[PDB]
Amino acid sequence: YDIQAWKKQCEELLNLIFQCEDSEPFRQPVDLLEYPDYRDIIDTPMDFATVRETLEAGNYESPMELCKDVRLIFSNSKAYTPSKRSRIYSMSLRLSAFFEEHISSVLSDYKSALRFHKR
Ligand SMILES: O=C1Cc2ccc(Br)cc2N1
Incomplete structure (x- = not known):
């Protein structure tokens, strides 16, 4: 029930x-x-170095916040790709699936640790 384990994970x-x-x-x-198409259509740019820098600065309070920023990378990519005919599309779909597969236990364990803390 380690409330802090999510960060190293x-x-x-x-x-x-x-x-x-x-x-x-x-x-x-x-x-x-x-x-410039990314500039005009993307309200909030996001990338993995910014996610990592935010995490290392101690500016995420939970893995849910990190997950929101990583999901933003993928939703921005989907807005940028008008069809399935680009490598950015292919890569984004696979990387998102990999991320979601691996973040699920991190979120489950953190939410369980908070419920135990408040029991
Ligand atoms: O290097 C690049 C250029 C570029 C345009 C759009 C999106 Br989404 C990601 C990237 N990465």
Whole structure:
């Protein structure tokens, strides 16, 4: 029932994500001058280095907040891809599935730890 365990679990999951070839387009912020369609359609840019930096700064209070930012990477990618005919689309779908598969136990364990704390 460790309330703090999620943080190292998220650090390790981000390490797996960065090693995966599918994360390459999502590792760093998009240059808004080079990709103006992203600039116009994306209200809140997000990328995995910003997620990792936020986590390391101690600026996430829960893994649910980290999960919201990672999900934003994928929803921004979906808004950017008008069809299935681009590698960004293919990579985003697979990386999202991998992330969701691995974050589920992190969220379950954290929510269980909070319920135990408040029991
Ligand atoms: O390097 C790039 C250019 C680019 C455009 C749009 C999206 Br979503 C991700 C990325 N990554």
